[PDB]
Amino acid sequence: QVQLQESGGGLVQAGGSLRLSCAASGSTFGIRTMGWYRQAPGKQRDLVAIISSGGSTDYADSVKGRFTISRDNAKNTVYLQMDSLKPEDTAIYYCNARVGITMLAHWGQGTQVTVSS
Numbered sequence: 001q002v003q004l005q006e007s008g009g010g011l012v013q014a015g016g017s018l019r020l021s022c023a024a025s026g027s028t029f030g031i032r033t034m035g036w037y038r039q040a041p042g043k044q045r046d047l048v049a050i051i052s053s054g055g056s057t058d059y060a061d062s063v064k065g066r067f068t069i070s071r072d073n074a075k076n077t078v079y080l081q082m083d084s085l086k087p088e089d090t091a092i093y094y095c096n097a098r099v100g101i102t103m104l105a106h107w108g109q110g111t112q113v114t115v116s117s
Contacts, residue, residue: 002026002105004095009111012085020080020111022095031097031104034078036069038091039110045094051078062088085115 008020022034033052039045048060049069057069068081078095092112097104 002028002031002097004105004108006093006095006108006111008080009093009113011114011116014086014115014117016085016115018082018085018113020082020093020095020113022078022080024076024078024105028076034071034095034097036067036078036080037094037096038089038113039094040091043091047098049080082113085113087115087117089113090115 003025005023012018035047035050037045037047048063051057051069051071066084071078092110094110
């Protein structure tokens with residue numbers, strides 16, 4: 001069982017930055033991937049950044065070059081550095097790992113990101 005603790009979001013001006021933190025606990029040793037998802041108002045939740053245990057990363061086109069996902073193994077935390085924020089980035093952000101059809105963990109409350117202009 002893996003629990004995920006999301007933090008770092010909030011209200012920020014366009015062009016500003018936020019750093020999201022996804023802290024994992026439980027059977028964390030075997031986590032293959034970890035993704036940052038976002039869910040804009042009224043929209044499906046989509047994966048926008050993902051990192052492998054090896055540190056490999058992948059990004060949704062919309063956030064490429066602006067968001068950076070990284071992990072600190074010692075702290076069992078996966079970060080999303082969000083730079084050059086746009087109003088279009090407003091969403092609740094969640095971290096999770098997909099395991100087949102289902103997810104590694106119950107979805108957390110996520111962390112609201114609101115980008116004002």
